[PDB]
Structure formats: C-alpha cells, structure tokens
Design a protein around this ligand. Structure first.
Ligand SMILES: [Ca+2]
Ligand SMILES: [Ca+2]
Ligand SMILES: [Ca+2]
Ligand SMILES: [Ca+2]
Lengths: 228, 65
C-alpha cells in the first residue's frame, strides 16, 4: 500500500541508456546535456552551462513516485549552480531556472548548490510550486517561494545521491539517500509538501546549470513509477 | 550449442542488466533487432501479454509463457 508500477516510457537508465544515434529513448534533451551509455551529464563542469532532459509525452498518473540517482561533482568546496527535478504541464527544455524554463506550471525540486543570498544555508533542496506566472527568485535561492526545503550536501559524495520523490494523495514527499554509503535504500527524510496541487497531466524532467563556478551534474537514472 | 529453452533463458538473462531477474520495458527496448513509437507498440504488447500483475516487470516464466 500503495502498489508501484514501473513506467518505462517516463524513465531512463544504463547500461544502454542511449540509442545507436545517441538520443535517449522517449526523452528530449537540450542545451549542453550530454547523454551517454551509463548516465547523462546534464551540465558539465564548464562555465555558464545549461542542459535539460524532458519526457517526450505527458504522463497522466493520479499518484506517482520517481527515483532519481545522480552525482554533483566539482573541485571546490563550493560549487554551482545545481540540478532540478521537474513535473510540469509543458516541457521546459531551455531557460534560466537550473537550465530549464521559468514560469512553469507544476513543481520543481531544486538541488541548489550555490548560496546566492549569502544565508549560509546551501547546498539546499528546495521545493517550489508554480502556476505558470511566478518567476523563480534566483537571487534569494527561492527562499520565499519554497513550499518546503532541507539542507543536504549532495555534492562530492562517494556513492550516487538518490532522490525519491513521491506524489501521493495531494502530498509531495522528498526522501534523500545522501550517498555516504553504497546502500542504495538508505533514505532519510528531507521535506514534505501538504496540499500539493499539480497539473493532471505533465512532463517529467531533469535539468542543471553552472555559472562562474561549475560542477559536473550527472544523472545515472530517472525511474518513474505509477502508484495505485 | 544451445537448445531452444537455453537460448531463451540466455536472451532473458543477457538483457537483465540490473540483475533483478525481471525484464522491464527499457530492457526490452534493447532486446529488439525503428522509431520510438513502433518500439512503444511492441513493448506495450509484450507487457500486456506477459505482465500478469501489471507492475511493469516480467519474470522468466511470463516471458517464456
Ligand atoms: Ca542558488
Ligand atoms: Ca541560500
Ligand atoms: Ca531487470
Ligand atoms: Ca509483473
């Protein structure tokens, strides 16, 4: 309770992640995202990068859960800019919000590495809802827009970080495996959104961006489950 | 040389990349050979016919029918 159905059409993973032509089956990629056989480098550790990967079609699931496995790797104790996980009405292939479009209709879960407001509260994981009219407040790390958040250093961890994001009965729950160990099921609570309203149909997505400082933002897998 | 039942289990095992002894739609997409829409049609068909509990996975018995 509830039961999960794996949804291949809204998922990707290795070890044959890309097709013979380097495309990701069922997903569109844009900007400087680089797909490969065992991961997508959504944005590489170069200056001023943007990249994204979005499902080609909308999903229509009443309740759902995504498990996203990733690394954010950089030479410095401080990195930028971060990675975003999305469920939104429209594809946001390119834009200023962690590589994706602003003014989305849905939810973004932002893994924000860089402390733009100097509040000494990064890296942070920030959940921001939007109806299509709100501009992401990048300068303040979306602080006044955040439905819920946690502080979690997802950078430079020895094992892949995992985010399990569950939309169930109008609530959104984010659990995080911090990647300190190779135990892939070691999740800890991050944040929960009550009265979470999202579109009935929408694309899933992942995106990343860099600035003057730059990490490699790598996604090893994005696994989507329908909950019934 | 491998028998019919042996090549079938070999095909199943060779495409079970995560080792969970089940095939999912992504694994099945690698086990053909086309457009993504044709691929979807084929995979949806296999799941419809094989996946008895509708969890998105098929075991060897279901695959082998
Ligand atoms: Ca920031
Ligand atoms: Ca901050
Ligand atoms: Ca498998
Ligand atoms: Ca099954």
């Amino acid at each position: 309770l509830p039961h999960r159905r794996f949804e291949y059409k809204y998922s990707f993973k290795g070890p044959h992640l890309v097709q013979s032509d380097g495309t990701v089956p069922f997903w569109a990629h844009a900007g400087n995202a680089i797909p490969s056989s065992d991961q997508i480098r959504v944005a590489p550790s170069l200056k001023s990068q943007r990249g994204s990967v979005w499902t080609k079609t909308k999903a229509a699931f009443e309740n759902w859960e995504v498990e996203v496995t990733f690394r954010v790797t950089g030479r410095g104790r401080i990195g930028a800019d971060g990675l975003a996980i999305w469920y939104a009405e429209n594809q946001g292939l390119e834009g200023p919000v962690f590589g994706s479009a602003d003014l989305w209709n849905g939810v973004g879960i932002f893994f924000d590495s860089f402390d733009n407001d100097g509040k000494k509260n990064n890296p942070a994981i920030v959940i921001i809802g939007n109806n299509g009219q709100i501009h992401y407040d990048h300068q303040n790390d979306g602080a006044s827009q955040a439905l819920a958040s946690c502080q979690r250093d997802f950078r430079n961890k020895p094992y892949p970080v995992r985010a399990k994001i569950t939309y169930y009965q109008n609530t959104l729950t984010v659990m995080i495996n911090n990647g300190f160990t190779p135990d892939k099921n070691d999740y800890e609570f991050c944040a929960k959104v009550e009265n979470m309203i999202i579109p009935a149909q929408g694309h899933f997505g992942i995106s990343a961006a860099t600035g003057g400082l730059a990490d490699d933002h790598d996604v090893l897998s994005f696994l989507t489950f329908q909950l019934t | 040389e491998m028998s019919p039942q042996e090549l079938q289990l070999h095909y199943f095992k060779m495409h079970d990349y995560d080792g969970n002894n089940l095939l999912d739609g992504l694994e099945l997409s690698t086990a053909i050979t086309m457009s993504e829409d044709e691929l979807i049609n084929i995979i949806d068909g296999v799941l419809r016919d094989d996946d008895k509990n509708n969890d998105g996975y098929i075991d060897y018995a279901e695959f082998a029918k």
